[PDB]
Design a protein around this motif. Structure first.
Motif, mmCIF file in Angstrom:
data_model
loop_
_atom_site.group_PDB
_atom_site.id
_atom_site.type_symbol
_atom_site.label_atom_id
_atom_site.label_comp_id
_atom_site.label_asym_id
_atom_site.label_seq_id
_atom_site.Cartn_x
_atom_site.Cartn_y
_atom_site.Cartn_z
ATOM 1 N N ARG A 21 0.861 -1.205 0.000
ATOM 2 C CA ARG A 21 0.000 0.000 0.000
ATOM 3 C C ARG A 21 0.878 1.228 0.000
ATOM 4 O O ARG A 21 1.856 1.269 0.738
ATOM 5 C CB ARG A 21 -0.893 0.072 1.262
ATOM 6 C CG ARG A 21 -1.957 -1.068 1.382
ATOM 7 C CD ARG A 21 -2.820 -1.031 2.675
ATOM 8 N NE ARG A 21 -3.783 0.054 2.637
ATOM 9 C CZ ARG A 21 -4.977 -0.003 2.060
ATOM 10 N NH1 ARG A 21 -5.375 -1.110 1.406
ATOM 11 N NH2 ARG A 21 -5.785 1.043 2.171
ATOM 12 N N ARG A 22 0.527 2.244 -0.792
ATOM 13 C CA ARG A 22 1.326 3.451 -0.765
ATOM 14 C C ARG A 22 0.548 4.360 0.192
ATOM 15 O O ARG A 22 -0.589 4.728 -0.067
ATOM 16 C CB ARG A 22 1.273 4.124 -2.139
ATOM 17 C CG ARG A 22 2.298 5.237 -2.259
ATOM 18 C CD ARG A 22 1.863 6.577 -1.712
ATOM 19 N NE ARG A 22 2.721 7.667 -2.250
ATOM 20 C CZ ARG A 22 3.056 8.773 -1.598
ATOM 21 N NH1 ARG A 22 2.687 8.928 -0.323
ATOM 22 N NH2 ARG A 22 3.764 9.741 -2.239
ATOM 23 N N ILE A 23 1.178 4.729 1.289
ATOM 24 C CA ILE A 23 0.535 5.437 2.361
ATOM 25 C C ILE A 23 1.195 6.807 2.560
ATOM 26 O O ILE A 23 2.046 7.221 1.780
ATOM 27 C CB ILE A 23 0.548 4.641 3.680
ATOM 28 C CG1 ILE A 23 1.992 4.505 4.213
ATOM 29 C CG2 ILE A 23 -0.115 3.222 3.454
ATOM 30 C CD1 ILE A 23 2.028 4.085 5.731
ATOM 31 N N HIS A 24 0.794 7.518 3.605
ATOM 32 C CA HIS A 24 1.271 8.923 3.767
ATOM 33 C C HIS A 24 2.783 8.996 4.043
ATOM 34 O O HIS A 24 3.461 7.977 4.357
ATOM 35 C CB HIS A 24 0.489 9.602 4.891
ATOM 36 C CG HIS A 24 0.717 8.967 6.215
ATOM 37 N ND1 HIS A 24 1.676 9.427 7.099
ATOM 38 C CD2 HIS A 24 0.174 7.851 6.781
ATOM 39 C CE1 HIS A 24 1.725 8.611 8.145
ATOM 40 N NE2 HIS A 24 0.801 7.669 7.986
ATOM 41 N N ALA B 1 -0.649 0.995 -11.424
ATOM 42 C CA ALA B 1 -0.766 -0.494 -11.273
ATOM 43 C C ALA B 1 0.479 -1.349 -11.688
ATOM 44 O O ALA B 1 0.873 -2.322 -11.011
ATOM 45 C CB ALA B 1 -1.997 -0.986 -11.967
ATOM 46 N N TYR B 3 3.646 -0.589 -11.734
ATOM 47 C CA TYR B 3 4.823 -0.510 -10.887
ATOM 48 C C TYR B 3 4.757 -1.518 -9.706
ATOM 49 O O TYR B 3 5.844 -1.988 -9.253
ATOM 50 C CB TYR B 3 4.993 0.868 -10.306
ATOM 51 C CG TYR B 3 5.432 1.897 -11.428
ATOM 52 C CD1 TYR B 3 6.428 1.548 -12.371
ATOM 53 C CD2 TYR B 3 4.845 3.150 -11.546
ATOM 54 C CE1 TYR B 3 6.879 2.431 -13.369
ATOM 55 C CE2 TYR B 3 5.265 4.068 -12.589
ATOM 56 C CZ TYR B 3 6.279 3.712 -13.466
ATOM 57 O OH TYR B 3 6.775 4.602 -14.436
ATOM 58 N N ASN C 21 4.170 7.486 -7.985
ATOM 59 C CA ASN C 21 3.091 7.394 -8.949
ATOM 60 C C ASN C 21 1.741 6.859 -8.493
ATOM 61 O O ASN C 21 0.775 6.828 -9.252
ATOM 62 C CB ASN C 21 3.595 6.642 -10.170
ATOM 63 C CG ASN C 21 4.758 7.341 -10.793
ATOM 64 O OD1 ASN C 21 4.566 8.363 -11.476
ATOM 65 N ND2 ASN C 21 5.981 6.812 -10.591
ATOM 66 N N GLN C 22 1.672 6.421 -7.249
ATOM 67 C CA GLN C 22 0.431 5.805 -6.797
ATOM 68 C C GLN C 22 -0.086 6.757 -5.745
ATOM 69 O O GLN C 22 0.667 7.251 -4.911
ATOM 70 C CB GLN C 22 0.684 4.453 -6.127
ATOM 71 C CG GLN C 22 1.255 3.407 -7.064
ATOM 72 C CD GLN C 22 0.302 3.051 -8.190
ATOM 73 O OE1 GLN C 22 -0.267 3.861 -8.819
ATOM 74 N NE2 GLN C 22 0.144 1.820 -8.431
ATOM 75 N N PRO C 23 -1.391 6.966 -5.739
ATOM 76 C CA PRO C 23 -1.934 7.901 -4.733
ATOM 77 C C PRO C 23 -1.967 7.325 -3.358
ATOM 78 O O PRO C 23 -2.057 6.094 -3.199
ATOM 79 C CB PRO C 23 -3.353 8.172 -5.246
ATOM 80 C CG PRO C 23 -3.654 7.012 -6.155
ATOM 81 C CD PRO C 23 -2.382 6.540 -6.734
ATOM 82 N N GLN C 24 -1.859 8.152 -2.333
ATOM 83 C CA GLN C 24 -1.810 7.546 -1.011
ATOM 84 C C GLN C 24 -3.176 7.083 -0.508
ATOM 85 O O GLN C 24 -4.200 7.697 -0.835
ATOM 86 C CB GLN C 24 -1.211 8.453 0.035
ATOM 87 C CG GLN C 24 -2.057 9.638 0.381
ATOM 88 C CD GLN C 24 -1.388 10.405 1.579
ATOM 89 O OE1 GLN C 24 -1.785 10.257 2.734
ATOM 90 N NE2 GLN C 24 -0.330 11.111 1.275
ATOM 91 N N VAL C 25 -3.163 6.011 0.305
ATOM 92 C CA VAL C 25 -4.337 5.370 0.873
ATOM 93 C C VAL C 25 -4.019 5.188 2.345
ATOM 94 O O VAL C 25 -2.858 5.263 2.731
ATOM 95 C CB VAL C 25 -4.658 3.949 0.138
ATOM 96 C CG1 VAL C 25 -4.909 4.182 -1.294
ATOM 97 C CG2 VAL C 25 -3.435 2.992 0.305
#
Lengths: 99, 62, 31
Positions: A21-24, B1, B3, C21-25
């Protein structure tokens, strides 16, 4: 196209039991499931950033692993990110049998 | 997606066969030396064995 | 082979590609 990419992501999530997950604050959270066979959905997670020097930095680990600083030093030295991830999962597996 | 799936390859060195029934875990695992096929029947195994087994393909030497 | 480029990429580059490149969640918690 894009369908094939989402499909690939779900196959890896389900088969490796690993979600990313890309998080803060510039961090990625790695969440392992399928660790405790008596509770397959229970997550074991750590978070990672690349710091201003361009180094791997583990910024948190839940539950904590006493070897993850050693693993951070090793991945920095070897650049072997595959082995870093494999060794963290092994360490969560083990931790799940402790007590 | 793209990456994220690229990083899952970097980690696991697995490339899935995307044209097979959902019940079939099929793909190839790559390494230094020769590439190894995977073709498992998901119905025969627990989710955790599938994940532990697939991860045992990934070398832990630094 | 076909993975040539991924095999030689530096994982820090690949990790930064996701982060930029990926938005944060939200992070998942033990809860």
């Amino acid at each position: 196209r894009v369908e094939r990419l989402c499909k690939s992501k779900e196959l890896f999530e389900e088969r490796l039991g690993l979600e990313i997950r890309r998080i803060h604050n510039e961090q990625l959270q790695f969440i392992f499931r399928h660790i405790d066979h008596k509770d397959p959905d229970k997550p074991y997670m750590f978070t990672l950033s690349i710091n201003e020097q361009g180094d791997y930095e583990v910024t948190s680990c839940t539950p904590p692993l006493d070897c993850i600083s050693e693993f951070q030093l090793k991945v920095r030295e070897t650049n072997n990110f595959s082995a870093f991830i494999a060794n963290i999962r092994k360490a969560f597996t083990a931790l799940s049998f402790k007590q | 997606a793209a990456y994220v799936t690229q990083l899952y390859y970097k980690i696991s060195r697995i490339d899935w066969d995307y044209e097979v029934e959902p019940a079939r875990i099929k793909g190839i695992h790559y390494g230094p030396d020769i590439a190894q096929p995977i073709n498992m029947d998901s119905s025969h195994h627990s989710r955790c064995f599938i994940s532990d087994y697939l991860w045992s393909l990934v070398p832990t030497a630094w | 082979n076909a993975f040539s480029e991924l095999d030689s990429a530096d994982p820090r580059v690949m990790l930064r590609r996701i982060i930029q490149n990926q938005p944060q969640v939200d992070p998942l918690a033990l809860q």
